[PDB]
Design a protein around this ligand. Structure first.
Ligand code: ATP
Ligand code: ATP
Ligand code: MG
Ligand code: MG
Lengths: 17, 477, 476
């Protein structure tokens, strides 16, 4: 059970004005 | 006479300047009452109904804070990001051309005009590194006179005498490694150094309050670990950049890596974990890299120096090695004197033998307790170590003394004295209480040893020359 | 005095110019003072309440920046994507229609006007690492002459004689590796080559410091690793694009990777994370691929030669693998000469025997101290390396020596001299101080080795044929 790091993936957001 | 406000953009030789007003750039002249040459870029100026400059004000505005990315080559513009990942190029104001601007620092900017008026320092703040100033000083530490002198020469001496070092062309040390057995006292020296630095920053220079807190950035081993790829390196770079920017000429900034042994293990060791092969290279690159530290001292305390990576222990990164040794009889006497002060209540019967002489009574009690701990009797026989040849070496409790153990003995004696006060009503402290505390502690530490224990082979087998193959607990009960 | 401003859009034969102003496009007449022939698209102009163009000006310098997406066929327009994934077709102004506006370039643009002007990325932060050029040159490095000759032949020589290389159809080496034990002087060469390159750029092209420093990049190691997937590879691609742009077949760009093992591995040694499994192929493609770096040199420094991926350690990528060995007696003498300068104060006791001849006295002291430290006496015995064969070997402190240790010894001697002059008042470094510093240093670095150390013992174990099973410190 070796500890492992992570890399996340962003999700686009919808913003107006 | 209603007078408006606008933002100055640039100056021209025609005594006329460009001002952003009402959302548009207008080229307008200056009234004779105000000098156009004295004006500066990014200045809030006053206007009127005839569109003429009448007054120039401070660089005060309300604007969004944008993270600085990079200054342009021409040195007048910088790239910043926004909340919506919006990148913009903005002219730097007069005060921002003052400490050097660095990436990752928030700048107050108005996107409509695109001017960064000032930099907000508290937006990029780290409270984890800051540590509360301890009360412990050098006078509160005993039995380590040589180590204290060595660390003083390593840290305080170069900054007190800078002209002589410049004359001899000598640079201050770029790292100190305090190492040793558990309980012998390493955090205490760090507290004393931090307190001395706090005093130097408070009274010698007199800058302001909280300035002492700013120096001596303290971080523990596990604190740097994060759950991501290439995030601990970001912390290392940020803390080293903060230390570099805060330090000045003759100004010492000390970074303490307490519990150095757990983190920064030797690369290639440890099947379960692999964070070392990333954290250690960053530290090796930050210290003694292509661009080196100027006035930064890195202090590392570790109970397992052997476990630390060999690349960081070499000279140039950790130059001054200070080993803390277990106290001897004189060191034990000094440590006891550091705790059994004259302000502790003494029983009248205790002072009877010396006609109320508190100092002599305390000195005699300290001598008695030191003799009791440093007597080779069947009571103090702790373990026997048998090597391959079969010879047995008897190790007593004296070989396992520590300042923490002495403090615990004193505290247990005080607790027993208070119990006696509550039960029998007789106030004061008794030497027999100290003797009973000694017996209790040495009986309690009987079950600690195991088949193999650390911190003893490296100091025993070297002189003996024989590998330790068995350790036996001595007479029980 | 009150005069407006606007943005030029296009010109006509009617002595009329289209100007965008106040959020609207108009057509206006130029004043007789200004000639419409010299006007270019995107130039900023000054207006008035009479709405007449009076004077042209430089292009806009600030605003939002938008990554370029593609270049249209006509060449006067290009598609660019905004920050929030909005795409617009915008004209290309005069300065962009120098280096081609290649796709993938965040162009400075005005959305309302619809015109482009400039660009840049975050890889420049690497250039910010070397804000101060080190002053150490090749004259300050001692004990290494063949290595300095090789590193000069790899970098300075190809650009010193272009015609000879062209005649022999020989290209400059694509990459250089420097490897050796810690403290042997890899970073010294790494910063000396950068100093030399900065001097060359200052003396040849221009006296500006920023442009001279712009030709050396300092990676610092794991700085490339990022939180999000595919961003570190993009950073590497941007770095190599920046490197290829500055090259002109006569100006080298040196990208220095420090601690090569940090980000490069054998793609299987990664246990906790395998980011290198994606990072390595990107760099391999960047170095050699369908399109190859013509005039870019990559210099890597590491302490673990074998741990690097075999693909990187290949001819055609890392052509010359310079090995830096631990100093011998001659190298120690050279280092001491480089450190014990003639101008250091010296006690009159030392000068009494040599009639005050500072140089001869210092040379004699250096020889005496190097002889003292390079002595095979029982007091210098450090470790006993054993093997399965049984050929026990006694190692001395001289074996574990480096320039860093010599510098530390000199610093300790200087500290002892300063303490002596503070306490007693007689200045001058003494010979006995160096001997005391040597023995104190060898005592301080005694209990360093761990149970097993693959640092430099692997080579000796391979030489003897058997593996190490036990080592002990032989002191007292
Ligand atoms: N002169 C002294 N020498 C040793 N210990 C002392 C001395 N004076 C006081 N002590 C006490 O010893 C205790 C332990 O000290 P310290 O916390 O420095 O050990 P440590 O270095 O943290 O050990 P480790 O690093 O192995 O945990 C302290 O609580 C302190 O009160
Ligand atoms: N001729 C020399 N050979 C080796 N070291 C030298 C020499 N002259 C001076 N030194 C000193 O040695 C120190 C270490 O050199 P350097 O920084 O190049 O090693 P390094 O690349 O950091 O090693 P590693 O990367 O393995 O830690 C320098 O601070 C320098 O002052
Ligand atoms: Mg501690
Ligand atoms: Mg190095």
């Amino acid at each position: 059970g070796s500890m492992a790091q992570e890399q996340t993936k962003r999700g686009g957001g919808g913003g107006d004005d | 006479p209603p007078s408006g406000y606008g933002v100055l953009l640039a100056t021209h030789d025609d005594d006329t300047v460009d001002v952003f007003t009402s959302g548009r750039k207008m080229r307008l002249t200056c009234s004779p009452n105000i000098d156009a040459a004295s004006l500066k870029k990014g200045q809030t100026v006053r206007l009127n109904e005839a569109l003429t400059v009448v007054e120039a004000g401070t660089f005060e505005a309300v604007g969004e804070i944008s993270t600085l990315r990079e200054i342009l080559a021409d040195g007048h513009r910088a790239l910043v990001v926004g909340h919506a990942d919006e990148e913009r190029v903005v002219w730097l104001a007069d005060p921002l051309i003052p400490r050097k601007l660095r990436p990752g620092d928030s700048l107050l900017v108005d996107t409509k005009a695109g001017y960064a008026f000032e930099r907000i320092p508290k937006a990029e703040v780290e409270d984890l590194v800051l540590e509360e100033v301890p009360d412990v000083s050098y006078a509160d530490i005993g039995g380590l006179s040589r180590q204290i002198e060595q660390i003083r020469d390593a840290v305080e001496l170069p900054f007190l005498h800078k002209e002589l070092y410049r004359e001899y062309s000598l640079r201050p040390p770029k790292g100190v490694l305090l190492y040793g057995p558990p309980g012998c006292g390493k955090t205490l020296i760090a507290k004393a150094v931090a307190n001395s630095l706090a005093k130097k920053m408070a009274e010698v220079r007199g800058d302001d309050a909280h300035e002492a807190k700013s120096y001596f950035l303290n971080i523990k081993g596990p604190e740097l670990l994060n759950k991501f790829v290439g995030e601990t390196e970001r912390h290392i770079r940020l803390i080293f950049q903060r230390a570099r920017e805060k330090a000045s000429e003759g100004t010492p900034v000390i970074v303490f890596f307490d519990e150095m042994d757990s983190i920064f293990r030797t690369r290639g060791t440890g099947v379960s974990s692999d964070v070392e092969t990333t954290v250690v290279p960053q530290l090796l690159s930050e210290i003694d890299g292509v661009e080196g530290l100027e006035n930064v001292i890195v202090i590392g305390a570790s109970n397992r120096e052997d476990m630390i990576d060999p690349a960081i222990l070499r000279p140039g990164r950790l130059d001054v090695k200070i080993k803390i040794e277990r106290p001897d009889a004189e060191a034990a006497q000094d440590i006891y004197s550091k705790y059994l002060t004259e302000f502790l209540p003494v029983h009248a019967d205790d002072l009877a033998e010396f006609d109320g002489d508190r100092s002599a009574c305390i000195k005699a009690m300290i001598e008695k307790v030191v003799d009791r701990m440093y007597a080779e009797i069947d009571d103090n026989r702790f373990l026997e170590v048998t090597y391959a040849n079969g010879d047995k070496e008897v190790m007593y409790f004296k070989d396992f003394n520590s300042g923490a153990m002495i403090q615990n003995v004193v505290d247990r004696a005080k607790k027993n004295a208070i119990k006696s006060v509550l039960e029998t009503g007789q106030p004061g402290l008794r030497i027999q209480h100290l003797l009973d505390s000694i017996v209790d502690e040495f009986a309690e530490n009987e079950d600690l040893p195991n088949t193999t224990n650390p911190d003893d082979w490296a100091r025993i087998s070297g002189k003996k020359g024989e590998r330790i193959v068995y350790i036996r607990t001595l007479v029980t009960g």
